[PDB]
Design an enzyme around this catalytic site. Structure first.
Site, short mmCIF file in Angstrom:
data_model
loop_
_atom_site.label_atom_id
_atom_site.label_comp_id
_atom_site.label_asym_id
_atom_site.label_seq_id
_atom_site.Cartn_x
_atom_site.Cartn_y
_atom_site.Cartn_z
N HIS A 8 0.80 -1.23 0.00
CA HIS A 8 0.00 0.00 0.00
C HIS A 8 0.83 1.28 0.00
CE1 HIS A 8 0.91 0.90 4.18
NE2 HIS A 8 0.63 -0.35 4.49
N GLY A 21 1.34 -1.58 12.28
CA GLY A 21 0.73 -2.88 12.12
C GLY A 21 -0.77 -2.75 11.94
N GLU A 74 -1.08 -6.51 7.88
CA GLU A 74 0.31 -6.45 8.30
C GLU A 74 0.35 -7.21 9.63
OE1 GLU A 74 3.50 -4.55 7.21
OE2 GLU A 74 3.66 -6.39 8.41
N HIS A 76 0.59 -7.93 13.54
CA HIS A 76 0.11 -7.16 14.69
C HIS A 76 1.29 -6.96 15.64
CE1 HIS A 76 -2.84 -6.85 18.35
NE2 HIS A 76 -2.34 -5.68 17.99
#
Ligand code: NA
Lengths: 171, 170
Positions: A8, A21, A74, A76
């Site tokens: 992204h 995250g 993504e 954590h």
């Protein structure tokens, strides 16, 4: 199986160097610019995206209308969410640099992250474009034996789970 | 899919020639040296390891933090654990040499062993480095039509389940 993975567009924490995250940050103006440049550069295949805002918005600006899946998120970072990479305890830094034995308190272990990501990829029945995150792209590239760092708003195509096909970055 | 099958470093029963299965022996100093040498060769792929000490320690010294799976353990030799290969009844030697018809008292059947190993292998969802044992490596090599004997502390990479990619004997 041919799979395209898109990292992204940038958020403020990219330039700031903070662990990003599950914190749901929006894209920056440049991040949107990056996402728009992807339109016309990615193949017309079924699209899937992390459900986090920055990913969804990238997919949208890229001319796609993907089906949302948390499995593409993504990793954590738990208590490390938002922490400056610079100030991370060496144990965490080394764990992330070597991509191994990483278990942040209140977060997701690298092993669980990989299992989640790879299980999702196994479930794909045909070629598709995946709007996701740097860590996901990294996990995939590293598993295919290559350096896994790619720029925000860039993409990579792979023949999963055999080899990397191409890395695409735009200016 | 690329899989690296790594045979753990040597233990005392290797130089002694004793059947080593579920007996949890540690590595010898040389076994640890062999493990360290692997750090400069094995690719940084997701790692998995037999939960036995010698395998875990090999992974650690090779620079990995593996997910532990008992499915990667060597076959359980039962009452034969620690027995000298030299003294094994001719029937046992024959079976282990042909790789068929082996089920020691109190141990595992050679068939249940392979069933355990291949279920694990078919379950992998991405390339990986597998810290395991001689029998497991042998089972995989034989499945690909090759001689499965590899030295302790060495490795073999395979494109599962098609062919062997390369052997790394240090
Ligand atoms: Na015994």
């Amino acid at each position: 199986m041919e799979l395209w993975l898109v990292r992204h567009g940038e958020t403020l924490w990219n330039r700031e160097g903070r662990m990003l995250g599950w914190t749901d940050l929006p894209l920056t103006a440049e991040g949107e610019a990056q996402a728009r440049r992807l339109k016309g550069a990615l193949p017309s295949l079924p699209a899937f995206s992390s459900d986090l805002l920055r990913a969804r918005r990238t997919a949208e600006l890229a001319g796609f209308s993907p089906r949302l899946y948390p499995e593409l998120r993504e990793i954590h970072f738990g208590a490390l969410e938002g922490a400056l990479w610079e100030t991370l305890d060496p144990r965490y830094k080394e764990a992330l640099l070597r991509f191994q034995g990483f278990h942040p308190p209140g977060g997701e272990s690298l092993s669980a992250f990989q299992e989640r990501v790879f299980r999702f990829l196994e479930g794909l029945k045909a070629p598709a474009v995946l709007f996701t995150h740097g860590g996901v792209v990294r996990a995939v590239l590293r598993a295919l034996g290559e350096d896994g760092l790619v720029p925000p708003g860039s993409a990579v195509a792979v023949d999963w789970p055999r080899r990397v096909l191409v890395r695409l970055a735009l200016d």
